[PDB]
Amino acid sequence: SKGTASFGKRHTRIHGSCRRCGKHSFHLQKHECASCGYPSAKMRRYNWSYKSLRRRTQGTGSMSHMRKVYRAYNSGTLKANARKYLAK
Amino acid sequence: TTQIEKNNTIVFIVDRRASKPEIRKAFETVFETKVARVNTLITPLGLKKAFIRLAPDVQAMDVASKMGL
Amino acid sequence: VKYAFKSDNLLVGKSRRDGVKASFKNTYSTCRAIKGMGVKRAFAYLDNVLNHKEIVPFFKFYKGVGRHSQARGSGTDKGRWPEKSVVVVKDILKQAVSNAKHAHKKEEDELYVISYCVNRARGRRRRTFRAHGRISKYESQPCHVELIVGPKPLD
Amino acid sequence: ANLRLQKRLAADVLKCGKRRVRFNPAHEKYIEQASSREAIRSLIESKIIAKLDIKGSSRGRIRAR
């Protein structure tokens, strides 16, 4: 009854999917994400686990805009920058 | 194919974002026909499917043949 | 590479089946019995074991096999009637006899079962659920039976 | 072979349970071919498929007591 018999009464979802992190970490009663931190505007990151930090970070995704803008800085965005720095 | 023959109905996979008013208007312009009732479902694979019942005066088999159904 | 018998031009006929889903211990015993047996006598004997009219003497894996009357003159008091083994050992015997008769122009009477080699094979592994939330192995013990029929009367 | 679909369909057409559906032993082939409610219905007219009586309990002894 403390063990297998009470495992039979499990038939609810306490954690749903998170809008920001897409993980089964969004508590549905407390309306907060265990990993994402959502609804907070700052993402929830703790230095005690670097493994969690590695799991969701810059570079674990497309990094689209940043990749293109880093490549552009290496090519011709610095010269365009000089024209607006010269300004009027 | 039976639905075209008996219920004057064409079954069409449509954009999920689309609504029954838009699908009636779209079918009516692209196929140049008249639609009476649209009933739709979102499939277990996530794709909306619309059962387009055509107007009684129109014959669905003629609309289907023109499309290639 | 898979055959263990290296006759020097003895005009033998051979067959082998690999990963045979039958017990290694039961098959070993059935093959051992047909050794030194004329091919025609062996086919009848395997058929008698299938009908439970003759016994396969178990000389190497006998812990749990029961003392039986049909094993009276076998040299052992223990034997059993392996059915899934007899079927397999006969099919390989049938292939071996065809191979010898077709290639070496041999005859069923001329042929005798000169050699055999049944070896252990990797077994399918399933899981038995034990008590107190434990899991244990339920693995098969397959064989690699090789049979060679030969013109020699095993002089 | 499996006449499972035929006995499910026939029970639906004869509005009885699969226990009360009774196929003709002679025609195992004719029924095997049927795969549609309509085909089963044609066989039901042919009396190669029939629903049994509800086999209800006798109430004659009860009436006498």
Partner: protein, 50 residues
């Protein structure tokens, strides 16, 4: 479950849509040798959304 939400149903339908084996022609094109998707899930042994 029969009373699901479209947003739970659409994330579940992706899994049904992608529980597929590598197309045989893909194995031939890439000389893959390993032909098992390994991301395939069987409803009984699996716990999606867990």
């Amino acid at each position: 479950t029969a009373n699901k939400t479209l947003s739970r149903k659409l994330r579940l339908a992706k899994k049904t849509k992608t529980n597929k084996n590598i197309p045989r022609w893909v194995i031939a094109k890439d000389h893959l040798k390993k032909t098992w998707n390994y991301k395939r899930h069987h409803w009984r042994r699996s716990h999606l959304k867990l």
